[PDB]
C-alpha cells in the first residue's frame, strides 16, 4: 500500500527478471496515478546500471503499455523501442557513429565516429529489438546502408574487435545488449556485443580526418559512462 513498499516490490521483480510481474504491478500503478512509483523505480534501476531495465521497458512495450514507457522512462527508451531514426553519440568525444563508403571485403563497411558529420543521413541508425531467453537484444541498423553493426572475428593486440556494418545476421556478432547509466542530466548506455560481450567504443587513436575507429573494447567500462557510453538522440 504505501508507495515506498510498492516501489520496492516493483524494483525487486525486475531485479529477479520476472518481467510479467513487473508489467502487471506497473499497469496497476499507472492506472492509479502512481507513475511516481514507476519513475522512481526506473531512476533506481538506472543509477545502479541494471541491464534488466531494458527488458522491463521492452516487456511494457510488448504488453500494451507503451504509454508507461513514454511517460515514465528517459526519452531514449521510446526512441529505441519505436525504432525512430537516431544518432549514436559517444559521450567522451561527442562524435556520431557512421559507416565508411568503401567495403572491407566480407566484413562490410568500416564503422567509426565521424570527425565532422553529426547531422547528415549518413549518421542515422535504428534499434531493432528482439526477445530470446528472457533477454532483449538489438540489431543496430545503419539506415542509409541497410547494414547491421557487427563485431568482426579478428582482434587487435589488446583483444579488441573491429566494428563493421554488414549485410547479414546469422551470428550473435550482429546483436547487442544495453545497460543504462547516468552522467549529469544525461541518460547514456553501454552497448555490449552479444557474441563477445565487449562494449562498443571509439578508439583513443585519432585518424588525421578526425575520425575514430569503432571497436568492441576488451576492458572494463563500468563506472565511467563519460568515457565508454553512448547517448541516443532523435535524428
For residue 15, the minimal CB distance to Pt ion (Å) is 24
SS3 assignment, position 225: helix
Least distance from C-beta 21 to K ion, angstroms?
10
Is 117 among the residues that bind K ion (CB under 5 A)? no
What is the CB neighbour count within 10 angstroms for residue 21?
Answer: 15
Q: Name, in order, each residue with C-beta under 8 angstroms of 49's C-beta and a sequence gap of 6 or more.
A: 179, 180, 181, 190, 222
CA 43 to chain centre: 16
104 binds, among K ion, Pt ion, none (CB under 5 to 8 A by kind): Pt ion
Query: Residue 200 CB, nearest distance to Pt ion (Å)?
Result: 16
Answer with the entry of K ion, Pt ion, none that 33 interacts with (C-beta below 5 to 8 A by kind): Pt ion
If you compute the radius of gyration of the chain from its CA atoms, what whole number of angstroms results?
A: 18
Separation CA 182–CA 50 (nearest Å): 11
Minimum CB distance to K ion, residue 27 (Å): 11
The nearest distance, CB 198 to K ion, in angstroms, is 31
CA distance 43 to 186: 12
Task: Please tell me whether residue 36 binds K ion under the rule CB under 5 A.
Answer: no
What would the x/- binding string for Pt ion be over residues 117 to 156, using CB under 5 A? ----------------------------------------
Q: Report the run of H or E that residue 165 belongs to, with start and end.
A: strand 161-166
Alpha-helical (H) ranges within 16-151 are 19-31, 35-47, 52-62, 66-72, 75-81
Q: How far apart are CA 176 and CA 213, in angstroms?
A: 18
Q: Which residues pair with 189 in a beta bridge?
A: 180, 230
Continuous H helices in 82-144: none
33 binds Pt ion (CB under 5 A): yes
Residues 187-226 that bind Pt ion (CB under 5 A): 213
By rule CB under 5 A, what count of residues binds K ion?
1
User: Which of 5/153 has CB closer to K ion?
Assistant: 5
CB of 20 to K ion, least distance (A): 4
Q: 20, 67, 71, 83: which one contacts K ion (CB under 5 A)?
A: 20
Listed residue (140, 98, 91, 101) closest to 118, CA to CA: 98
Closer to K ion by CB, 29 or 151: give it: 29
Q: Contact residues for K ion (CB under 5 A)?
A: 20
Q: Contact residues for Pt ion (CB under 5 A)?
A: 33, 104, 213
Amino acid at each position: 500500500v504505501p508507495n515506498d513498499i510498492l516501489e520496492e516490490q516493483l524494483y525487486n521483480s525486475i531485479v529477479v527478471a520476472d518481467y510479467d510481474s513487473a508489467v502487471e504491478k506497473s499497469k496497476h500503478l499507472y492506472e492509479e496515478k502512481k507513475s511516481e512509483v514507476i519513475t522512481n523505480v526506473v531512476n533506481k534501476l538506472i543509477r545502479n546500471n541494471k541491464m534488466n531495465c531494458m527488458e522491463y521497458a521492452y516487456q511494457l512495450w510488448l504488453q500494451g503499455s507503451k504509454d508507461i514507457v513514454r511517460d515514465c522512462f528517459p526519452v531514449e527508451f521510446r526512441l529505441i523501442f519505436a525504432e525512430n531514426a537516431i544518432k549514436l553519440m559517444y559521450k567522451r568525444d561527442g562524435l556520431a557513429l557512421t559507416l565508411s563508403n568503401d567495403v572491407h571485403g566480407n566484413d562490410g563497411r568500416l564503422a567509426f565516429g565521424d570527425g565532422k558529420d553529426k547531422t547528415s543521413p549518413k549518421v542515422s541508425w535504428k534499434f531493432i529489438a528482439l526477445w530470446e531467453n528472457n533477454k532483449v537484444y538489438f540489431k543496430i541498423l545503419n539506415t542509409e546502408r541497410n547494414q547491421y553493426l557487427v563485431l568482426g572475428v579478428g582482434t587487435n593486440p589488446n583483444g579488441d574487435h573491429m566494428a563493421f556494418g554488414v549485410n547479414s545476421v546469422d551470428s550473435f556478432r550482429a546483436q547487442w545488449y544495453l545497460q543504462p547509466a547516468k552522467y549529469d542530466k544525461d541518460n547514456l548506455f553501454y552497448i555490449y556485443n552479444r557474441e563477445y560481450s565487449k562494449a562498443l567504443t571509439l578508439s583513443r587513436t585519432l585518424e588525421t580526418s578526425g575520425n575514430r575507429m569503432a571497436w568492441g573494447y576488451n576492458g572494463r567500462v563500468i563506472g565511467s559512462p563519460e568515457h565508454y557510453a553512448w547517448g541516443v538522440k532523435a535524428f
